């Protein structure tokens, strides 16, 4: 639910998806990539007041009942997507799928 | 990996698995579980000096304007087997994603 549809419409201070465009040559020094020239990688950022996994719900409950709280949550990636690229070995084209390059959704963990 | 084997007897300040024992009745208010009385839930915590996090770390050095800074969070989760009663009939259940097994900087 903390995806582009929800986040990229109203700039919110709390956790959720943030737009980020990365140029391979300029931003990463990956000069060998023929296609694409860059991509919408995005990132996750913002305050976590907001309980995806059973373990996250357990910790959240424990932190209120035990006098000594454990960890506090932070904004991180939930769903990721690969990115397909094109490079050349001499004149031979090579297509590669790079897993987990794009962040589609965020969560407080 | 950032797991019990690496982290537990090597207490350092960077991102690591940390021990946390939780008592069901005392800490959660879950009075229905018969066995076990508690379990090692653990958690992830510490400083952070996937391909997306590795590209973000590279972008943050090359671009003059850095984006997000990494978080210490749960990587792998494990189920916990419990025993409870529905009346006087025993019921074993595997409760999904109850334990954190390893951590990551993301």
């Amino acid at each position: 639910a903390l995806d582009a549809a929800y986040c990229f419409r109203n700039v919110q201070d709390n956790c959720c998806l943030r737009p980020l465009y990365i140029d391979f040559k300029r931003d990463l020094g990956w000069k060998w990539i023929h296609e694409p020239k860059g991509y919408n990688a995005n990132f996750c950022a913002g305050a976590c007041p907001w309980s995806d996994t059973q373990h996250s719900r357990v910790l959240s409950l424990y932190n209120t009942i035990n006098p000594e709280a454990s960890a506090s949550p932070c904004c991180v990636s939930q769903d990721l997507e690969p990115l397909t690229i094109l490079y050349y070995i001499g004149k031979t084209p090579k297509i590669e799928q790079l897993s987990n390059m794009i962040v589609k959704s965020c969560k407080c963990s | 990996a950032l797991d019990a084997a690496y982290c537990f007897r090597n207490v350092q300040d960077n991102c690591c698995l940390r021990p946390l024992y939780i008592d069901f009745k005392r800490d959660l208010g879950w009075k229905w579980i018969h066995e076990p009385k508690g379990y090692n839930a653990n958690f992830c915590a510490g400083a952070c000096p996937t391909q997306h996090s590795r590209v973000l770390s590279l972008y943050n050095t090359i671009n003059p304007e850095a984006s997000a800074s990494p978080c210490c969070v749960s990587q792998d989760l494990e189920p916990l087997t419990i025993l409870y009663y529905i009346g006087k009939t025993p019921k074993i259940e595997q409760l999904s994603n109850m334990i954190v097994k390893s951590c990551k900087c993301s």
Partner: antibody
Amino acid sequence: QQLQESGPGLVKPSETLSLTCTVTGFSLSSYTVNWVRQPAGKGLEWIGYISYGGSAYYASWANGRFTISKDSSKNQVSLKLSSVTAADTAVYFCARHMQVGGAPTGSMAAFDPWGPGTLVTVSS
Amino acid sequence: AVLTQSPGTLSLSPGERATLSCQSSQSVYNNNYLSWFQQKPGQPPRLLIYGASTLTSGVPDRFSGSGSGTDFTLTISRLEPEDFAVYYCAGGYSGSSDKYAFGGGTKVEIKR
């Protein structure tokens, strides 16, 4: 196992107070550190802590004025008090939870060791 | 969460039994999250008892604690001159804020 508070000693009214507690012989990733103040001729008052796991919790009377955080790379715990008043004149102590966090037996409301304390006078 | 300590002051001779009460407004976490401290002037408090009845390493045998839930008592069986101090109780609680709280203290003065 030692705790030592550092502070400016004298602070002007409405300014920001910044205290430091330097830790020796133990890891901040293992133990929770608390701030406790004691006004002249008054009892001890728990302000809050920065837990072994990184969670900050405060007394109700704090009203968002206090920020307790740590930097384990500098072996330091900090307290930040905004808009100080004469009511904030007190000896401020740094005090560790007696036991490591997350074990089946907690610290049972015990604090040990304590720092020697640093006096903060709020005055023009 | 409020801890009430009584009496506010007690003056007793070396050899006498000192009985200090600590009453919690709400149950302490696990019924035993209650500790006792001794504070001497210009010094940080010294932990004496933790978990209502467990004596800290090096603390004399004359100190003993009891109670569970809400009513706690600190006993100093055979008072010594070095036992003059202000004694505090501290409780542990569930909540979003007041995780810990100290009692108002009992001042122990030695009669001579």
